[PDB]
Amino acid sequence: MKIINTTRLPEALGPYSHATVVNGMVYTSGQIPLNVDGKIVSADVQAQTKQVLENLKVVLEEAGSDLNSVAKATIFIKDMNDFQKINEVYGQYFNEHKPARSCVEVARLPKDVKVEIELVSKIK
Amino acid sequence: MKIINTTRLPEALGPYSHATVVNGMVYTSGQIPLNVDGKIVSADVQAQTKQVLENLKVVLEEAGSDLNSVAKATIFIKDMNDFQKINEVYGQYFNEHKPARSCVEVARLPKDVKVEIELVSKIKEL
Amino acid sequence: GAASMKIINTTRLPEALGPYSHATVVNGMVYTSGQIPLNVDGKIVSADVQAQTKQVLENLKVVLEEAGSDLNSVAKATIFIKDMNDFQKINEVYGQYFNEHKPARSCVEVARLPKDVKVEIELVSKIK
Structure with missing residues (x-):
């Protein structure tokens, strides 16, 4: 078990970490669109x-x-009506490599953000 | 990292794959009720x-x-008021084998479908 | 033929009625079902x-x-x-359990939970 916390990002306030690494896999926390100051960017x-x-x-x-x-x-x-805009940006990060994905519209996110994403990844 | 795509599903047009396989486990994308032509079946x-x-x-x-x-x-x-009906169908597929599960009601699904299911499963014999 | 794993169902909790189990253990990881706030009698606790x-x-x-x-x-x-207005209260209790070890987490407001409960939590864990 490794705990991943970096001051390169907005701090995980309270009882979570940015990610854990366990059995060769990274489980990220959900990220929301904060900058390093913890401000919503846009x-x-x-x-x-x-x-x-x-x-x-x-x-x-x-x-x-x-x-x-x-x-x-x-x-x-x-909002599922934002899906095309979101998908466009997502496709810039996941261009050649295309993970498995689910996408749902929730009722509300932390700080009233519009998008939150969590990943499971393999250690290199 | 193995990318999985199958021609029995509508083509992954977009930045995803029907599933991946990593460390002997399969992570599927959320499946919605489209046939191979990309149409909602019912x-x-x-x-x-x-x-x-x-x-x-x-x-x-x-x-x-x-x-x-x-x-x-x-x-x-x-809709949670459809849970028992969804559950009845799910139990026809998971009769002998009973995995862990969670089920929540979301605000909206892709293409306004009523159900989306994702799975994590183990590869057989390797 | 099926891939090898351990299915977990304990008599310590209300039975998983129907086509699921309390947890599975697969390749050294525990996948729990989502837990809702049922008491030892199967009822919403409070x-x-x-x-x-x-x-x-x-x-x-x-x-x-x-x-x-x-x-x-x-x-x-x-x-x-x-309801995100419950998040501070939920987080206060969560932090009492996850005081020394702080796993990765996501928290989202859904439209509705089983039985109209206010919170449901699922976990992925390593064998100890």
């Missing part, structure tokens, strides 16, 4: 999707993995 | 549940797993 | 959200123990909730 859903994926890129790096090693993503979104 | 929630599970069966089999090898299912539904 | 969160975490402690795991071995939790 109201724009594309901009939020980018911040999320950038944050996750960092977690994967710090955990000993990368984007091309991701097995599964779960995308929780506030 | 409005009926039981017919949708059946199509989801048949779609998952083909993904598992293409990956070298099967429904009896499932570790965990997550069932996202549009 | 309307209070902190009582429900306690009951969920105590149920999950049971499942993890019976599977050969423990809270210190959890990789990832997902907390599904009915």
